[PDB]
Design a protein around this ligand. Sequence first.
Ligand SMILES: CCNc1cc2oc3c/c(=[NH+]/CC)c(C)cc-3c(-c3ccccc3C(=O)OCC)c2cc1C
Ligand SMILES: Nc1ncnc2c1ncn2[C@@H]1O[C@H](COP(=O)(O)OP(=O)(O)OP(=O)(O)O)[C@@H](O)[C@H]1O
Ligand SMILES: Nc1ncnc2c1ncn2[C@@H]1O[C@H](COP(=O)(O)OP(=O)(O)O)[C@@H](O)[C@H]1O
Length: 1353
Amino acid sequence: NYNGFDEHTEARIQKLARTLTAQSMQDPKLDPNSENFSSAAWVKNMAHLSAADPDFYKPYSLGCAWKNLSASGASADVAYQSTVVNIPYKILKSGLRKFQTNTFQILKPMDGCLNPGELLVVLGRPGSGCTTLLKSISSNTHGFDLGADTKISYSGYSGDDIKKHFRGEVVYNAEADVHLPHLTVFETLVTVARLKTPQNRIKGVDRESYANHLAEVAMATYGLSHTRNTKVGNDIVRGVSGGERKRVSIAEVSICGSKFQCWDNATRGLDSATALEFIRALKTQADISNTSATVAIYQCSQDAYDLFNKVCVLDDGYQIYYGPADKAKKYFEDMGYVCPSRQTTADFLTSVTSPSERTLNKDMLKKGIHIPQTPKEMNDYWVKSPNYKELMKEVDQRLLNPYTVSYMMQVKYLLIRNMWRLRNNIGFTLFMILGNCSMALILGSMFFKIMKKGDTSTFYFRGSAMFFAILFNAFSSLLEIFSLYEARPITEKHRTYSLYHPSADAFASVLSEIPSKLIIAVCFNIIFYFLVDFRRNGGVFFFYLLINIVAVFSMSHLFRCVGSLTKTLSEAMVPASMLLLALSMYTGFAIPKKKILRWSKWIWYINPLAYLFESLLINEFHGIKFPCAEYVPRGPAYANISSTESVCTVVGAVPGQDYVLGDDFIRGTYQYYHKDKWRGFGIGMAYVVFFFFVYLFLCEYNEGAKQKGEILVFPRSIVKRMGLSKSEAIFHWRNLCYEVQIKAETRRILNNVDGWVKPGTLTALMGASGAGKTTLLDCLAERVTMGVITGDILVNGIPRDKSFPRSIGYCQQQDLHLKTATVRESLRFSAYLRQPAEVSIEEKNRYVEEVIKILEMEKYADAVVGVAGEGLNVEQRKRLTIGVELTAKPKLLVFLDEPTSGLDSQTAWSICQLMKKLANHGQAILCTIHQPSAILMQEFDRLLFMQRGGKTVYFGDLGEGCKTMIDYFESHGAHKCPADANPAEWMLEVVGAAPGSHANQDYYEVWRNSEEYRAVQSELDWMERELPHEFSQSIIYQTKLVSIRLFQQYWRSPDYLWSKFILTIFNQLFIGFTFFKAGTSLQGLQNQMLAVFMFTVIFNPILQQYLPSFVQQRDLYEARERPSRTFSWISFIFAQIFVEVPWNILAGTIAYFIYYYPIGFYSNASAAGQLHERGALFWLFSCAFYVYVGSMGLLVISFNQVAESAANLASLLFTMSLSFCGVMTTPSAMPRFWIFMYRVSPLTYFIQALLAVGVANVDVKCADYELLEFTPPSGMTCGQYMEPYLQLAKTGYLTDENATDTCSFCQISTTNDYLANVNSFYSERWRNYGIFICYIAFNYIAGVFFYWLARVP
Ligand SMILES: CCNc1cc2oc3c/c(=[NH+]/CC)c(C)cc-3c(-c3ccccc3C(=O)OCC)c2cc1C
Ligand SMILES: Nc1ncnc2c1ncn2[C@@H]1O[C@H](COP(=O)(O)OP(=O)(O)OP(=O)(O)O)[C@@H](O)[C@H]1O
Ligand SMILES: Nc1ncnc2c1ncn2[C@@H]1O[C@H](COP(=O)(O)OP(=O)(O)O)[C@@H](O)[C@H]1O
């Protein structure tokens, strides 16, 4: 707990000062080693000496003073919802509107002043202009225009002046907790301290020592010393508590020396005590650093409100009161309103703007005095009031009258921060190193055998192995983008106040990866170059390693540039995928430099991997003579021969040689010359430097964040034009208990709890944070699974049956709804599945209308749920959550879990009024409540109060003004409740659960021996004696509804489907037109094989695009639809399959149409008289491949919790299948060990059948450079000479059978014989299609089974 400079922090800071001065040694008000030393004086001295630099003309304090302040923004006229068939027109129309308006007055003219050292609380309802005010007075007016008449003076500096120079002296913080999760608090603060040390003006203490001291003083000042070595953490990574996480942000901004601050949503997610601690830390900062801060907060506690000097009250953008906080209540009570005795002043000030909550002073109405009731009237009254006159006197007088450390020091400190990040998340990096090591091991094992012999038979495999090496080194840096994106928001924060250049952060990020990149390169290349058995000369190996280093750095920088240009990784997925495809395909192995068409030769020329692969091949092949493997004239008939009458069967061969000079081979096949060896290094370094500079430039300037108004979406079909059943049984539980084995052997969470809820009564379930409130709801609702429950939970005196979980309604704290659905659609979806089967759908529609009317959401019934930022706000989402359960016609109860938590006071009161209205209708509502205000407590009929450990302390009708509860407690020793104390908080103090932990006695035992307890027992006995199909719809109907909703999600998810289809179109079109009519040359055939190979590499991105949709569906299901018994997991998974398949089939059809024909497989099929059959079968394979990618995505996500891990697993399996599919290395060339992997991978059968269909049953046309030349023996034509050989190796054709001086030979006559070498056959095509479909079926079935295992309980 934090108490804002109690003597403990003073002693801690005195110890720190003694340590600093003693370390240096190795006026009496300030000498730590003496008496009279004052810790406040010490911190104040440091804060002054931080801003006392002779070169700095910054102020010692800033205080804003504005008048006429008015802001406005372009009206956000509600716009229709984006859908796959509508987003193109939407983009076109938006582009036209930008190519070629009304306004909304966000804030009407306001005035105010805030001297240094003061704290201002801005009070207003949501949408009242609080955030806009904080952005205006902090000069963050991006997204809206500021009035032409506004005047803002920061103690003399115009807002323009602080924007130009002193930015960071005025700081606006939307959320406090934006931190690197994996740094400890001390590291997070020491990096900031280092970046702020005035590097020229410290003597006697080393700069690291001073930075450490300043970080420790910041921690002690804000009560964080106990978290020195704790990880800062996150909502998903364990670390310091939320309050400590926000006080870390306060300490950080304190170190950075901002003199003016704003905190828009400071206390979001904090309970009363923790929010008070945060405000107290802010007050301590104001006292010490003399900063002025402004906080916009809801549910402001009276204790917290006591700390603010000034208050600002808004409603509809009008200012109603500005001035001292303690005068606000009296000012409004003079206005004509009255504060209920127990109402905290902040709630009074905020409610005075809410007509259904205010209370007009009846006396002042009898006098006929007008009491303003609408915001304009209140603002006019304030303008008239003497408070405004006095405020303007103060304002008018005040309107009458870049980085601390050099660039390289910023780089150094940010690099150290990055290394700390790595050494705290080191597990990921270790798995990362091991992944590359293992992939190198596997690939090298795959090439080990064939490469070993070294004959000319290994040329294609040398090419393929070097292609793998260059790819797996160049792209082994791409998973640093995760860290890049994670760091970007904190870089933006640290830019909002001048701490370092964003270029310094980018440069630190680049330099921090060098260790990992070098280690990966060394390990991978050492393992690979040895297994693959490239040249063992040391110099060539080191040149190879150098080229790989240049490749990895080049790609790292190129894709950092892309990452910098996108909001998230998902948005970069598409262009990054295009870049990967272009670079990998045009590296010079898939299609040699000779065969690249004129339309895309420039791609080779600008591709760095092309030049680097050139250098690698020149290095590998240059100057080495590979002994010839096999000759054309061959066999016993050719035992005796002259050397020149034979030739080696490879490109660079010359007749009569026993070897082929690898340089000749590469010159013939790729046209790389030894003179170009060092071109690769030069171009690679040129690219590396250029893209490094462009990365710095982009990170320096292209960033920002813009404000936009909350909007409702109202799908286009709407924009074209634009009775609740009573509870019937009494639910009572007796002697309830619950134990779980997790934290301790037989640990009780509930202890003999008992009670009941009757129809038409709203029951409050209260307790401290924890205390088994939600646990009691989960047990009563039979929503809990683990542990053992004991005791009675009876309905109408009878044990709850198997229909009970359906008969009740349970509104969870988290309002989770399918974002793409609409409010009306969501309610109708809930009604259809859960209401009794025999109810006609028109009646379900009418009941949904009744429910919509009751919740008074009719004005936005058609809106899209969306998300927090766009769509329904918190109140609307809560109302939708309640409606969804009301539409299930819960026969028995309605369980609510903290409906009023996370809301403001006025929205909370609105929700409580809705709950009481429902109870009046007849509903039996049991709802957990947290820190309710005394006014809300007047709504609940009964109160079940539970002490820590699930130990009931009270259960009774709290009656009027909580008098019954107060009386029960006071009669039993509790100290009298003050007439102005909140009964909820007071009772929480009586039992000792609230801080100040001590109780006059164990009140659990007082209850157990109370008279109320025996009365409850008698009533429970009478309830015991008053006693006189797991799913509603069948599985087929549930599947129908769920699949329809999932379709409506794909539709209306234009980003996903358009990314999928544009990626398909671009990738496959690029493949098809890179190999445009490749022809049937010997190289053309393997080029087409590699084209079919590249057709498959689209797998990863289109799987990763799909996974988020499944995760979005699955979260909603498992979190609300499953416990509610809305539908069975069977329907969920069948919908996931049935909806994903059709879109994959459509994408496959598009891919076929744009790939099969451009590349020319159609002409090959036509030449064979098989156009229709082969075209149809290729279309079937494309559709099957896309369906298979979908099925693999489903399989991997069926048990992986997060999408990233599922994507990684799918990528690894696809990599194995692709590597061992038998084209990068033929099956007979693999080690006998890997034949299982070759046989099992689906891509063997896919690729073999696809290539067979593409190029089977036609003739080969060997180009000039491919023909084999040799001289026929004396006195016989080549026609006669080659006949003996030609009859045994029964294929091949001489270009001239009657030549006698020399003849050219083609060793493949027809493409079928070539395909036989690749092991692909035409007669197998249909069997392969069947096998591939079997793979899809197994993927889907295994996915279903693994979802059943992993996820179903
Ligand atoms: C848009 C970028 N696309 C991708 C880039 C990737 O780069 C990777 C770089 C790596 N090096 C460290 C940074 C490591 C270890 C794995 C990587 C994977 C990967 C992860 C798991 C299994 C296989 C692979 C994989 O295929 O890796 C091929 C290099 C990976 C995956 C995708 C989709
Ligand atoms: N360009 C714009 N920028 C900001 N708000 C706008 C704009 N156009 C219209 N508005 C509307 O003006 C109102 C201003 O309220 P604002 O959000 O600033 O205060 P608030 O809602 O109390 O702040 P917070 O959202 O942090 O609680 C909002 O309802 C918003 O929808
Ligand atoms: N592993 C666990 N899983 C679920 N609940 C647990 C576990 N360990 C302890 N608990 C119990 O969960 C309770 C916290 O939930 P609860 O108090 O119902 O939430 P809330 O107070 O927000 O309604 C604690 O009382 C604690 O005894």
